[PDB]
Paper text:
Uracil-DNA N-glycosylase (UNG) is a DNA-repair enzyme which initiates the removal of uracil in the base-excision repair (BER) pathway by cleaving the N-glycosidic bond between the uracil and the deoxyribose backbone. Uracil-DNA N-glycosylase from Atlantic cod (cUNG) shows cold-adapted features such as high catalytic efficiency, a low temperature optimum for activity and reduced thermal stability compared with its mesophilic homologue human UNG (hUNG). Ugi is a small (9.5 kDa), acidic (pI 4.2) and heat-resistant protein encoded by the Bacillus subtillis bacteriophages (PBS1 and PBS2), which use uracil instead of thymine as a normal component of their DNA. It blocks access to the active site of UNG by inserting its β1 strand into the conserved DNA-binding groove of the enzyme without contacting the uracil-specificity pocket.
The crystal structure of the cUNG–Ugi complex was determined to 1.9 Å resolution with eight cUNG–Ugi complexes in the asymmetric unit, all related by non­crystallographic symmetry. However, the crystal structure of the cUNG–Ugi complex reveals that the conformation of cUNG is almost identical to the uncomplexed cUNG structure. The largest differences are found in the Ugi molecules, which are very flexible in some loop areas not involved in complex formation (loops 29–35, 48–53 and 74–78), especially in loop 29–35, which has poor electron density and large B factors. According to the analysis, the interface area in cUNG–Ugi (average value of 1043 Å2) is smaller than that in hUNG–Ugi (1093 Å2). The interface analysis also shows that the average hydrogen-bond distances are slightly shorter in the cUNG–Ugi structure (2.8 Å compared with 2.9 Å in hUNG) even though most hydrogen bonds are formed between the same residues as in hUNG–Ugi. There also seems to be more alternative hydrogen bonds and side chain-to-main chain hydrogen bonds in cUNG–Ugi, as well as two electrostatic interactions in the cUNG–Ugi interface (Lys218–Asp40 and His250–Glu28) which are not found in hUNG–Ugi. For example, both the DNA backbone phosphate-mimicking Ugi residues (Glu20 in the inserted β-sheet and Glu28 in the following α-helix) are bound tightly in cUNG–Ugi. In particular, the Glu171Val, Val185Lys, Gln250His and Tyr275His substitutions in cUNG compared with hUNG result in more favourable interactions with the negatively charged Ugi and the DNA substrate. The larger binding enthalpy of cUNG–Ugi (−25.1 kJ mol−1 at 25°C compared with −9.4 kJ mol−1 for hUNG–Ugi) clearly indicates that the electrostatic inter­actions in cUNG–Ugi are more stabilizing than those found in the hUNG–Ugi complex. The co-crystal structure of cUNG–Ugi presented in this study supports the previously reported DNA-mimicking properties of Ugi.
Residue numbers in the entry:
A (entry chain A): 82 to 304
B (entry chain B): 3 to 84
Write the structure that this text describes.
C-alpha cells in the first residue's frame, strides 16, 4: 500500500480493512478535496518508512502534525529542512546539549536521522487541516495509533517509551510495564519545559535502558 | 484569528509555530488558575525580544482565548488572563 513501509503493512494489515480506518481515509480524502491538509499524503506514514518495525528501539509520542506550510512531514516534533525548529523542538535540542555530551544543534529540525536508527517518532493524530490545530481529532487516527502502540507493546520487548506531557502519558498508560521501559516527563513546550522537561535526561537514560538488553544505543547526535 | 488576537494584546504581528494540547492540571500551577477544560498552547517566537509568546485557548473547534503568556530566555513568565 502506497506510502506505507511493507514490514509495517504486513503487521498492521487487519486495521486497514476495518470500517473505522476506511471511514478515516475518506474523511482525509474529503478534507484534501476542499482544503490543504498536512502533512502531504506521501509523508503521512513517513515513520513507517525510515526503519523496519522490528528495528524500533525507542518511541517518542506526539500529538497532531504541525499545521503551517512545510512544517510537518510525518514524524513527531521534526520539521522539514530548512524550517526552523518549533518551540518544543528548541527545548528538545536544549535538553540534548546538556544530556548528550558532544551533541551539537544540527542547524535544522529534521529528525530523520533518529528515525533511521529505530526511533519511532509517532504522532497520535496523523493529519491536520492547514492552520487549524487538532482539527482532525477523533476521526479515526487515535484508534489506529492506539493499534500501532498496542502492537509494539505485545510483540516486541525492551522498547523504551518516552512520554512527554499528560496526553502522551495517557496514550501510553497500557504499555506492558513488564516487557518495556516507560519514562515520563512534562511537555517540552516553553509553558512547561523548565518544570521537568529540562534535566529529564531521557535520551541518555533511554541508552542506559537499551544497554540492559545488550541493545546498541541510539546515537542522538546523528541528525 | 489567533495571531490577530496576539497582535491586539501585545502589538506584535507573529506566526504561531505549534499548538500543544494540555490538561487543565498540566497548566494550572504555571498559570495560577485552572481552566474549565483542555488548553491548546499556541506558541510563536518573537525574534526581536527573544521571547516565547503563548496564546492559550480552549480546544478546537472553539479556540476560545483563555490566557496569554510572554516568556523570556530563562523561562520567566508574564501572564495575562484574557
Amino acid at each position: 500500500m502506497e506510502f506505507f513501509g511493507e514490514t509495517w503493512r504486513r503487521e498492521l494489515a487487519a486495521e486497514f480493512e476495518k470500517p473505522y480506518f476506511k471511514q478515516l481515509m475518506s474523511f482525509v480524502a474529503d478534507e484534501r478535496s476542499r482544503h490543504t491538509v498536512y502533512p502531504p499524503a506521501d509523508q503521512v506514514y513517513s515513520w513507517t518508512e525510515m526503519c523496519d518495525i522490528q528495528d524500533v528501539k525507542v518511541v517518542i509520542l506526539g500529538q497532531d502534525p504541525y499545521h503551517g506550510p512545510n512544517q510537518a512531514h510525518g514524524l513527531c516534533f521534526s520539521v522539514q529542512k530548512p524550517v526552523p525548529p518549533p518551540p518544543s523542538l528548541v527545548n528538545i535540542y536544549k535538553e540534548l546539549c546538556t544530556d548528550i555530551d558532544g551533541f551539537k544543534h544540527p542547524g535544522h529540525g529534521d529528525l530523520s536521522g533518529w528515525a533511521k536508527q529505530g526511533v519511532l517518532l509517532l504522532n497520535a493524530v496523523l493529519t491536520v487541516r492547514a492552520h487549524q490545530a487538532n482539527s482532525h481529532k477523533d476521526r479515526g487516527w487515535e484508534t489506529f495509533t492506539d493499534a500501532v502502540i498496542k502492537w509494539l507493546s505485545v510483540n516486541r520487548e525492551g522498547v523504551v517509551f518516552l512520554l512527554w506531557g499528560s496526553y502522551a502519558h495517557k496514550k501510553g498508560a497500557t504499555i506492558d510495564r513488564k516487557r518495556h521501559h516507560v519514562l515520563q516527563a512534562v511537555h517540552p513546550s516553553p509553558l512547561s519545559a523548565h518544570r521537568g522537561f529540562l534535566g529529564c535526561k531521557h535520551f541518555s537514560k533511554a541508552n542506559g535502558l537499551l544497554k540492559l538488553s545488550g541493545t546498541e544505543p541510539i546515537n542522538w547526535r546523528a541528525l | 484569528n489567533l495571531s490577530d488576537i496576539i497582535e491586539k494584546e501585545t502589538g506584535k504581528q507573529l506566526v504561531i509555530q505549534e499548538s500543544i494540547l494540555m490538561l487543565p492540571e498540566e497548566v494550572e500551577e504555571v498559570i495560577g488558575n485552572k481552566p474549565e477544560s483542555d488548553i491548546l498552547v499556541h506558541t510563536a517566537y518573537d525574534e526581536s525580544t527573544d521571547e516565547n509568546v503563548m496564546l492559550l485557548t480552549s480546544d478546537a473547534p472553539e479556540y476560545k482565548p483563555w490566557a496569554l503568556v510572554i516568556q523570556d530566555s530563562n523561562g520567566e513568565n508574564k501572564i495575562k488572563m484574557l
